[PDB]
Amino acid sequence: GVTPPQITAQTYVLMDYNSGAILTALNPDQRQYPASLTKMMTSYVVGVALKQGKIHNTDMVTIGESAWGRNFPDSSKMFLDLNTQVSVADLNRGVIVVSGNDATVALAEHISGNVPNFVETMNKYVQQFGLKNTNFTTPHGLDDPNQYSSARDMAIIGAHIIRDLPEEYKIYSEKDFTFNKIKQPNRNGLLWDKTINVDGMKTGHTSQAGYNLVASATTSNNMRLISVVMGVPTYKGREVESKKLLQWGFANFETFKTLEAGKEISEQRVYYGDKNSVKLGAFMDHFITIPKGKQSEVKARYELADKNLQAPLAKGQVIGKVVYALDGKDIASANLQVMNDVGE
Q1: Rounded alpha-carbon distances, angstroms, from residue 302 to 49, 225, 271, 276, 336
Q2: In 3D, which of 64, 32, 43 has the Cα closest to residue 174?
Q3: I need a surface site. Which of 69, 208, 214, 298 has the fewest CB within 10 A?
Q4: Dihedral (C-alpha) 78, 233, 159, 148: value to the nearest 10 degrees?
Q5: Nearest 5°: phi and psi at 265?
Q6: Quick one: fold of 1-252?
Q7: Phi/psi of residue 236, each to 5°?
Q8: Which residues of 32-52 are buried (b: 16+ CB within 10 A; e: fewer)?
Q9: Residue in 334, 327, 228, 208 with CA at minimum distance from that of residue 281
Q10: Which CATH class is domain 253-344?
């Protein structure tokens, strides 16, 4: 690990999307008011519901007094007027591009019938993503001391959007959105930065800490990073510190695939079964992140759990580990599985 940059932020994390490794961090698990990053979870619920066919972008949703722009007087909004009908596509675009508070209530009610129930789906996914430092009480992120997240949990949430909802994630790089004759911009300034390929994700601010932003950027070789900064003093500062994390990341590290799903990488002798050997590999891709330039020098080896393999063997069975070393230290590992059944 070389020198991490000096970052003006209460909390932050930088992480390779593909391998999940944290390249640098400060209080990654410290609890923070998520403010509008809450809308990332809200859009996750909406995007899964669209993906599963439980709602359709063409659903026309009726705006009544609880979704009405008037109830969000000093906060971001898409300007939904009472007694109009609005498509789920517009609503979701409005949550995603301009953090519309009125749009999130409208969606929560359309999907879950009311807001407390919708919020519970948000918390379902909190469990299902494996997060330990997040809890939502709203679909919009209005501050509440029972509502919190962390830099690492928000990195995990943004990876799931990018990974589970590729079609929805595209909306996150739209630069503005017009609705009800009002045009408002995406607030992630990094989308205008031609010198880096930022294509997400979401901004926020809370008087408890400062300004926050979740950004993700790619390289021509498909390296993808995700940064999160929280409690930054200035709203311009948050784009600067983020760009600092990302560029340090792309400057200093690289990511490569060490295993391909389904591929047989090895043959191993088996004792007492229907064949004399068995193919080993992994049923999923695997990726590691190393200092840039160092791919040549990485060395893989096995650690079967047992000395030799004895039948019966089940396809998919984990019988050991591939261990990756660089310059004499073990940097990264991954399961090794049996690829075909061996009975008897």
Answers
A1: 42, 29, 18, 20, 8
A2: 43
A3: 208
A4: -80
A5: -100, -5
A6: Beta-lactamase (3.40.710)
A7: -70, -40
A8: bbbbbbbbbbbbbbbbbbbee
A9: 334
A10: mainly beta
Q: Could you state, in order of their start, the residue ranges of all structural domains in the chain?
A: 1-252, 253-344
Report the catalytic residues: 36, 39, 99
Sign of CA dihedral 76, 79, 85, 90: negative
Token reading at 112: 């879950």
How crowded is the C-beta side of 119, counted as CA atoms within 13 Å?
16
**Amino acid present at 286:** H
Q: Is the previous residue joined to 284 through a cis bond, with omega within 30 degrees of 0?
A: no
Are 316 and 337 in contact by the 8 Å Cβ rule? The answer is: yes
Q: What is the resolution of this structure in A?
A: 2.2
